[PDB]
C-alpha cells in the first residue's frame, strides 16, 4: 500500500520510449524501458483531450476488468502514468495518461505470419493449455474478451503464454441481458452467431476463436479466410456444416438467419478435412468449432480434454526457432 498502490502520480518521464510495436484495440502500443529499474514495458496512450465524455469509458472498462484479473496467462497491468502535470494549473492541464503493461518477447501474429517458428504437437499443448487456463479464469469472473486474435496472444521465450488487450472486453450477465455489438471479432476468427447478428452473446465467442487458432497451429494457415461476412459464413459452413435448425434450434431466432444463407446446406466435413490432426486434438477442434453456442464446449471442458487434461506446465515448451537457416536457406 505504501508504494505501488499509488497510481497516476508518476510521470512518463520515468520511461524512455523505444518506439511503437503494433496496433491494439483502440490505440497503438509502444515499447519503453524504465529508467530506474531498466525493465521493458508496453504502453497504450489514453488521451483526455476530447471532452465529450472526458475520460474514455472504454479505457475505464479496460482498467476495471484488468485490475481484477490476476493470472499467469493474463497480461498484468503494472501501473498508470501521466504526462508532465502543471502545478497549481490543474484546470488548464491537458495532459494525457498512459497505461503500463508488462513486455513479452514475441507475439503470435509475428511468429506465424513470417513462418519462421514451428509448433510441435507438444508445443501446441503448452500453448493451448495456458491460453484456456487464462480464458477460463476470465470466463469464471464473467468477463468476455471480444478480440481474440494472434496479435493479442503474446509469448515469452520461456514458453509462457499470456492474453493481452482487454479494451474490447465487457462483462457478461446470464440473468440480465444488455445488447452488445454484432461485429466484435476479427472476421477470420468470428463466431457464427455474431455473424448471424446475435447481439447478446455467450462467452463461447472466445472458445470459437481459440478453436480456429488450434487448427491454424496445425495447418499453418488460418482456417477461415474471407473478406466479407457472408463469404466467411459460407467457408464456415463448408467445414463445420451449414447452420440448420437440427444442429442449432435457435438459429431461427437470430436476426439474419433467413437473410444470410449458404449456397447449399453443406454437411460437416471437419473430421475428414482435418484427418492429419491427432485424434486427441481433432475431437477438441470438433467441439470447439461447434455451430450452436449452446453446444460449443466451455473453456473448462477444453482443460478436461484428452489433449490438454494431462499436460504439465512443468514441461513448458517454447516454439522452435531456426538458426543458420535464417541467414541462408540451406543449399543442401
Amino acid at each position: 500500500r505504501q508504494t505501488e498502490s499509488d497510481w497516476g502520480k508518476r510521470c512518463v518521464d520515468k520511461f524512455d520510449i523505444i518506439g511503437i510495436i503494433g496496433e491494439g484495440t483502440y490505440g497503438q502500443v509502444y515499447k519503453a524501458k524504465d529508467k530506474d529499474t531498466g525493465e521493458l514495458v508496453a504502453l497504450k496512450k489514453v488521451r483526455l483531450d476530447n471532452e465529450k465524455e472526458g475520460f474514455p469509458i472504454t479505457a475505464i472498462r479496460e482498467i476495471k476488468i484488468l485490475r481484477q484479473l490476476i493470472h499467469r496467462s493474463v497480461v498484468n497491468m503494472k501501473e498508470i502514468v501521466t504526462d508532465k502535470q502543471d502545478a497549481l494549473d490543474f484546470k488548464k492541464d491537458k495532459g494525457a495518461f498512459y497505461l503500463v503493461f508488462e513486455y513479452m518477447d514475441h507475439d503470435l501474429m509475428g511468429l506465424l505470419e513470417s513462418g519462421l517458428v514451428h509448433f510441435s504437437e507438444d508445443h501446441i499443448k503448452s500453448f493451448m493449455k495456458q491460453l484456456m487456463e487464462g480464458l477460463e479464469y476470465c470466463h469464471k469472473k464473467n468477463f468476455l474478451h471480444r478480440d481474440i486474435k494472434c496479435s493479442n496472444i503474446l509469448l515469452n521465450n520461456s514458453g509462457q503464454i499470456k492474453l493481452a488487450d482487454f479494451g474490447l472486453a465487457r462483462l457478461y450477465n446470464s440473468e440480465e441481458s444488455r445488447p452488445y455489438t454484432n461485429k466484435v471479432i476479427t472476421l477470420w476468427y468470428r463466431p457464427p452467431e455474431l455473424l448471424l447478428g446475435e447481439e447478446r452473446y455467450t462467452p463461447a465467442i472466445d472458445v470459437w476463436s481459440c478453436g480456429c487458432i488450434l487448427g491454424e497451429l496445425f495447418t499453418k494457415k488460418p482456417i477461415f479466410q474471407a473478406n466479407l461476412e457472408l463469404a466467411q459464413l459460407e467457408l464456415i459452413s463448408r467445414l463445420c456444416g451449414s447452420p440448420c435448425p437440427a444442429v442449432w434450434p435457435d438459429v431461427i431466432r437470430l436476426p439474419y438467419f433467413n437473410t444470410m444463407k449458404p449456397k447449399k446446406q453443406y454437411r460437416r466435413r471437419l473430421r475428414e478435412e482435418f484427418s492429419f490432426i491427432p485424434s486427441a486434438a481433432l475431437d477438441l477442434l470438433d467441439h470447439m468449432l461447434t455451430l450452436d453456442p449452446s453446444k460449443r464446449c466451455t473453456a473448462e471442458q477444453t482443460l478436461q480434454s484428452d489433449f490438454l487434461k494431462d499436460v504439465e506446465l512443468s514441461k513448458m515448451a517454447p516454439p522452435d526457432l531456426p538458426h543458420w537457416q535464417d541467414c541462408h536457406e540451406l543449399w543442401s
Binding site: 523505444i18 515499447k31 505470419e113
Partner: protein, 826 residues
C-alpha cells in the same frame, strides 16, 4: 501511393528439372528443360541439342512430366506450379507456326492442408490412368486421367503415414500401386498401397513394409523386366520387390550424399546416380534368368564414372550423351565412354551451358572506365563457385572466373585496383586431427597468404570434440585483381569463424582505404553465435596487414559505411563505431529493438534495417544528440532476404516467399503515429529469391540523360541466376502501363490458361493479396511480339488522361515506340 516498374535483365538460368520423351512429334527425341517459370524444348541430335521452342508460364514449375495415354500419337506434358496451378499441354506445329495447346487446366489447392517438408511430389501411372500428387501431410491427391476431366478435378485419399519422403508409381502391378518411403518415430520404412479409382481409397498393397535406412532419400521405380523398387540412402542401396531383398552398401557412396537418379537402359539394367561433390556413378542391375524363363536380380553394382557438375537432375540422351542439369554450377553435356581416359575417367565434357547459379552478392563497377557499368557476381556453390563479370553488349557478355570454392560477399576497392571477396571451402576432419581439403581452390592457390593469429577467443581451454570425417567450413578473404582476376592474396580466418560482412572504405581522418570484415564464431551447440569480430585490414604492396580488431558479442551479419563511421549489426544490435586517431574502433551509439538485424542500408543520416520477422525499420543518427532514434517501421510482419532504399521516402524489400514490397512514409503528418507507420504501398510476387539489391545500371552511357520515362535503377540477383531491375514511375506513366496491362492480359494467351493477375498476387502460405504499385515490365515488353491485330485490339479505345491535359487517344505505333524506349533500360 508509390509507382514502380520491374523487368528481367537475365532470365533464370538454373535448371530445376529435365525430362526426355516424344513431346513435339511421336518421332523426335525431345529434352524438356525446366528453369524457374521457363520451359525450354530441345530436339536431340547426334551433335547435341537443337532448340525448337521456349515458353514462359505464370508460375514456378514444380512438377513437369511427360506421358502418353492410349489413343494419343505423342507424349503430353503435365505441369503443376508452386501455387497449385495444374495443366496438361500439347505441342502443335503448323509449318512455321509453333504453338503449345492447353488441353486441361485447374487449381488443385485444398482449403485445409499442411504443406509437406519434402515438397510437392508429382508422379504418373505407367498406364497413364491417373496423376498422383503429394501436396499435404496425411493426404494423397488423385487426378484421374479420363477424357472428360478437362477441368482436372481430383479427390483426396486419407494417408495414415503423415511424413512421406518420396513416392513413385510401381511397375508390373495388377492395379495402380504406389511405393513410398515414410518416417515415423521408429525410423524410416518403405510401404506400398494400391490405388482404386472406383472405390476412391487405398487397398492393401502388394508387398510388405520393411524397415529401411534412416537417411533414405529417393524411390526408384524399376521397369517391368525386374519390377519392384530401389531405395537410395546415404550409405546403403536396397532393392525391394515382394520377398526378394538385395542391399549393397558400397564404401564410395558414403563419402557424398546422392541427390539425383536416372535410368539409362529401359530394361532397368543400368541407372545413373549423382552426389554433391559432382561424382557420377552407374548403378548396374545384374540379371539372373531362371530356367522358368523369369528374370531375377543377381546383385547390385555401383561403378564410378567421373566428375560432373553438382547436378539437380541427370537425364540420359541416347548414344551415350547425358545432360547434367545443375542449380549450383554450369549445366553440361557429357560423353560416357566405354574406355576410360588416361586419368581413369569415362566422362568427357562436350558443352557447357552458363548458369549464373546462386547469386549470393554482387557489385556494380565500371572496370574498363567506359562509363558503361559491369556486374561482378559471387555465383555458384562449392566446386562450382565462381565470379562472373557481366556486361551489356543484343546479348549479355559474361566472363567466368572459377574459384572452386563457395563465394559469399564481394566489394570493390578502387585504390587497390582489386576486389575483396569472402569465401568458404569445405575440409573434412582427417586422421592427423586437423582437416584436409577435397580439392584445391582459390583460397589455397593464392599468390601470398596469411592466417589470423588473433588471441581474442583463445579463452576456451579445451577444444570442442572433433571426430574424423566431419565437414567444416574454412573462411577466407580473397584479394583478386580487377584486370586478371588472379588471386593475389588469401587471408584465412580463425577456426570456426565465419565471414559474413565485407566493406571497402576510408574512416574518420584516416587517409588509408581499408578492407573491413565482420565475423561470427560459430559452434554447433550455439543457437545464435555469441562471439564475433570486426577486423580492419589494409591491402598494401601485395600483403594484407591486420590493422585493428574489435571484439563483439555476436555475429556481424552486415556492415555499411555511414558518414565516415562504421555501421554494424551484431545479432539484435545495430551499432555505430567511430575510427579514432589511434586506429581503433570506438562505440558511439546503439539500437536494440530488433530480433536479428540481418540487412542494413543507408542514405544520408537515415538507416534502413531488415529484420528476420519484423520487416523494415527506419533509423536516424540524430547528430546533435548522438543516439539512434526510431523514425518509422513496417508493422506487417515479413521475413526478409534483401532490402534497398529507393529514395528518401520509398523503401524496397524482398520476402523469403518470393515476394517484393515497397514501404513509404505516410506523407500525411496528421498524428505522430501516421508518420511512424511505414505503409506497404507496393506488393508484387516476383517468383525468385532475391539475395542482393544493388544500385546501378549496366547500360552503355554516352551522355544519355533524362530521355527515359523511368527514374532510378536498382539491380538484383537471385538464387536461380535471374538478374532483375526495379525502377520508379510517375503517376501518369504508371496508369498508362497499368491500364495497358489489363488489356494485354485479355489479349495474350497464357500457357495453361494461368491468370496473370493471380500469378503476381502477393502470396504466402497465410496470405494472398492482389499486386499493387508494380508494373510487370516483362508483360509490357511482350507488346512488341504480339501480332499486329492483337496490338490494335490492345490500343483500341485507349485514352491517356495523364493530367495537365485532357484524355488523349492512343495509337499503336506510338505505343510500340514507348515500349522500345522502355527496352533500353536493360
Amino acid at each position: 501511393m508509390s509507382y514502380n516498374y520491374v523487368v528481367t535483365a537475365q532470365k533464370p538460368t538454373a535448371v530445376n528439372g529435365c525430362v526426355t520423351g516424344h513431346f513435339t512429334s511421336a518421332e523426335d527425341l525431345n529434352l524438356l528443360i525446366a528453369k524457374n517459370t521457363r520451359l525450354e524444348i530441345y530436339v536431340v541430335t547426334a551433335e547435341g541439342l537443337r532448340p525448337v521452342k521456349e515458353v514462359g508460364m505464370y508460375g514456378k514449375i514444380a512438377v513437369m512430366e511427360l506421358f502418353r495415354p492410349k489413343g494419343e500419337s505423342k507424349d503430353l506434358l503435365f505441369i503443376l506450379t508452386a501455387k497449385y496451378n495444374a495443366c496438361i499441354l500439347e505441342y502443335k506445329q503448323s509449318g512455321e507456326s509453333i504453338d503449345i495447346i492447353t488441353r486441361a487446366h485447374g487449381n488443385v489447392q485444398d482449403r485445409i492442408g499442411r504443406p509437406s517438408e519434402t515438397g510437392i511430389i508429382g508422379i504418373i501411372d505407367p498406364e497413364c490412368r491417373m496423376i498422383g500428387l503429394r501436396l499435404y501431410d496425411g493426404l494423397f491427391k488423385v487426378i484421374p486421367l479420363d477424357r472428360d476431366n478437362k477441368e482436372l478435378k481430383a479427390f483426396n485419399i486419407r494417408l495414415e503415414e503423415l511424413h512421406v519422403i518420396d513416392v513413385k508409381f510401381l511397375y508390373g502391378c495388377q492395379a495402380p500401386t504406389i511405393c513410398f518411403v515414410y518416417q515415423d518415430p521408429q525410423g524410416r520404412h518403405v510401404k506400398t498401397y494400391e490405388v482404386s479409382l472406383r472405390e476412391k481409397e487405398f487397398n492393401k498393397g502388394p508387398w510388405k513394409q520393411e524397415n529401411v535406412e534412416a537417411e533414405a532419400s529417393m524411390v526408384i521405380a524399376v521397369p517391368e523386366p525386374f519390377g519392384g523398387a530401389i531405395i537410395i540412402g546415404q550409405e546403403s542401396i536396397t532393392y525391394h520387390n515382394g520377398d526378394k531383398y538385395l542391399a549393397i552398401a558400397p564404401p564410395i557412396i558414403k563419402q557424398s550424399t546422392i541427390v539425383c537418379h536416372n535410368r539409362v537402359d529401359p530394361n532397368g539394367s543400368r541407372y545413373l546416380l549423382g552426389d554433391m561433390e559432382g561424382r557420377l556413378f552407374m548403378l548396374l542391375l545384374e540379371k539372373e534368368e531362371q530356367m522358368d524363363g523369369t528374370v531375377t536380380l543377381k546383385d547390385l553394382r555401383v561403378e564410378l564414372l567421373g566428375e560432373t557438375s553438382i547436378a539437380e537432375c541427370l537425364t540420359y540422351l541416347d548414344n551415350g550423351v547425358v545432360f547434367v542439369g545443375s542449380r549450383l554450377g554450369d549445366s553440361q553435356l557429357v560423353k560416357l565412354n566405354v574406355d576410360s581416359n588416361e586419368q581413369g575417367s569415362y566422362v568427357v565434357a562436350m558443352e557447357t551451358f552458363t548458369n549464373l547459379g546462386p547469386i549470393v552478392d554482387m557489385c556494380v563497377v565500371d572496370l574498363e572506365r567506359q562509363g558503361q557499368g559491369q556486374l561482378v557476381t559471387c555465383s555458384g556453390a562449392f566446386k562450382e563457385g565462381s565470379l562472373r563479370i557481366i556486361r551489356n553488349g543484343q546479348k549479355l557478355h559474361i566472363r567466368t572466373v572459377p574459384l572452386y570454392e563457395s563465394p559469399r560477399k564481394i566489394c570493390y576497392q578502387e585504390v587497390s585496383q582489386c576486389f575483396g571477396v569472402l569465401s568458404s571451402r569445405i575440409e573434412v576432419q582427417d586422421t592427423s586431427g586437423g582437416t584436409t581439403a577435397l580439392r584445391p581452390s582459390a583460397s589455397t592457390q593464392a599468390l601470398s597468404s596469411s592466417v589470423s593469429s588473433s588471441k581474442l577467443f583463445s579463452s576456451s581451454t579445451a577444444p570442442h570434440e572433433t571426430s574424423f570425417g566431419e565437414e567444416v567450413e574454412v573462411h577466407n578473404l580473397l584479394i583478386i585483381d580487377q584486370h586478371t582476376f588472379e588471386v593475389l592474396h588469401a587471408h584465412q580466418f580463425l577456426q570456426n569463424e565465419y565471414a559474413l560482412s565485407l566493406v571497402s572504405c576510408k574512416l574518420g581522418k584516416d587517409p588509408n582505404t581499408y578492407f573491413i570484415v565482420g565475423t561470427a564464431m560459430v559452434y554447433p551447440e550455439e543457437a545464435e553465435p555469441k562471439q564475433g569480430r570486426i577486423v580492419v585490414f589494409q591491402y598494401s604492396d601485395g600483403k594484407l596487414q591486420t590493422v585493428a580488431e574489435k571484439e563483439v558479442k555476436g555475429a556481424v551479419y552486415s556492415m555499411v559505411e555511414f558518414n565516415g563511421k562504421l555501421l554494424a549489426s551484431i545479432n539484435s544490435t545495430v551499432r555505430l563505431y567511430e575510427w579514432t586517431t589511434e586506429k581503433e574502433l570506438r562505440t558511439e551509439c546503439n539500437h536494440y529493438n530488433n530480433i536479428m538485424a540481418l540487412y542494413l542500408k543507408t542514405k544520408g543520416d537515415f538507416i534502413l534495417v531488415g529484420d528476420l520477422m519484423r520487416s523494415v525499420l527506419l533509423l536516424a543518427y540524430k547528430p546533435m544528440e548522438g543516439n539512434f532514434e526510431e523514425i518509422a517501421r513496417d508493422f506487417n510482419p515479413n521475413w526478409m532476404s534483401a532490402v534497398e532504399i529507393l529514395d528518401d521516402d520509398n523503401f524496397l524489400g524482398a520476402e523469403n516467399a518470393f515476394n517484393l514490397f515497397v514501404c513509404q512514409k505516410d506523407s500525411a503528418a496528421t498524428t505522430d503515429e501516421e508518420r511512424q507507420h511505414l505503409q506497404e504501398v507496393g506488393l508484387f510476387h516476383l517468383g525468385e529469391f532475391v539475395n542482393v539489391f544493388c544500385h546501378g545500371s549496366l547500360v552503355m552511357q554516352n551522355l544519355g540523360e533524362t530521355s527515359t520515362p523511368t527514374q532510378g535503377s536498382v539491380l538484383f540477383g537471385t538464387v536461380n541466376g535471374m538478374i532483375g531491375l526495379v525502377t520508379s514511375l510517375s503517376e501518369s506513366w504508371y496508369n498508362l502501363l497499368l491500364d495497358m496491362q489489363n488489356r494485354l492480359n485479355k489479349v495474350i494467351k497464357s500457357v495453361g490458361k494461368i491468370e496473370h493477375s493471380f500469378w503476381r498476387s502477393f502470396h504466402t502460405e497465410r496470405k494472398t493479396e492482389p499486386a499493387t504499385g508494380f508494373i510487370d515490365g516483362d508483360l509490357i515488353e511482350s507488346f512488341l511480339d504480339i501480332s499486329r491485330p492483337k496490338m490494335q485490339e490492345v490500343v483500341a479505345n485507349l485514352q491517356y488522361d495523364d493530367g495537365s491535359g485532357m484524355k488523349r487517344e492512343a495509337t499503336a505505333d506510338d505505343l510500340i515506340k514507348v515500349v522500345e524506349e522502355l527496352t533500353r533500360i536493360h
